[PDB]
């Protein structure tokens, strides 16, 4: 996964903009780590908002 | 004198007080009231009843400027947020949307020490 898959990334973001925990979503640990990295890169690139 | 139809209410509700400020959009104040301004001195400033009283006064004051629909923002973990937001509907405005705007640091400054009461 990568930061350009914004449609996939929105699937793991709440309405406020916070990352959804793995205990709630049902994710593998390594996949979750890659997700967090990609999401933090997307926020910097201003593809998705930081908060709200 | 100035007339405006759409306004914003700000409820700053701390653990010691509650300030209800009514402004227009772009944040120019029109009317405000606090629990201290209606007696309720000392610790009684934090009761929900005082928040309701202040909200009623603020809404009636803004009715002179003539607002009918407004957007409400509540910040602070006060005990009077619900009473303050309820009193506006009793006064007679239309609450288009009401939200929470409390600030949260992203691990910034160091808070003060813990009280050993």
């Amino acid at each position: 996964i990568d930061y350009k898959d914004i449609d996939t990334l929105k699937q793991y973001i709440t309405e406020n903009g916070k990352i959804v925990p793995s205990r709630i979503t049902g994710t593998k640990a390594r996949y979750q780590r890659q997700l967090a990295l990609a999401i933090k890169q997307a926020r910097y690139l201003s593809l998705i908002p930081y908060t709200d | 004198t100035r007339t405006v139809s759409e306004g914003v209410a700000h409820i700053h509700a701390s653990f010691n007080n509650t300030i209800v400020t009514i402004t227009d959009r772009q944040g120019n104040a029109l009317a405000w009231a606090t629990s201290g301004g209606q007696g309720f001195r000392g610790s009684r400033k934090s009761t929900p009843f005082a928040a309701q009283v202040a909200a009623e006064v603020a809404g009636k004051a803004a009715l002179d400027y003539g607002l009918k629909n407004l957007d409400v923002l509540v910040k602070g973990p006060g005990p009077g947020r619900e009473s303050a937001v309820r009193a506006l509907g009793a006064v007679g405005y239309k609450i288009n949307s009401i939200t929470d705007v409390t600030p949260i640091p992203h691990n910034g400054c160091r808070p003060p020490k813990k009280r050993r009461v």
Binding site: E15, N16, D52 | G76, P77, E82, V85, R86, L88, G89, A90, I95, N96, S97, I98, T99, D100, T102, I104, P105, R110, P111, P112, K113, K114, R115
Partner: protein
């Protein structure tokens, strides 16, 4: 961002917003920001929380 539709009452709006804020959990962060928690205390509290979580999981399994 609780935006009311055409005809809910003020009390319904208030209760729905309260539920939304309870889900959001901003007040927990605001309470945590009141005083400084030392790293020792934070680690102790998180260890206790983990122990309680593992105890709850076995009970729910049985």
């Amino acid at each position: 961002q609780v935006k009311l539709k055409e005809g809910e009452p003020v009390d319904v709006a208030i209760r729905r917003f309260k539920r939304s804020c309870e889900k959001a959990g901003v007040l927990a962060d605001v309470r945590k920001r009141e005083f400084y928690e030392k790293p020792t205390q934070e680690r102790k509290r998180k260890k206790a929380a983990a122990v309680k979580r593992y105890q709850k999981k076995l009970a729910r399994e049985s």
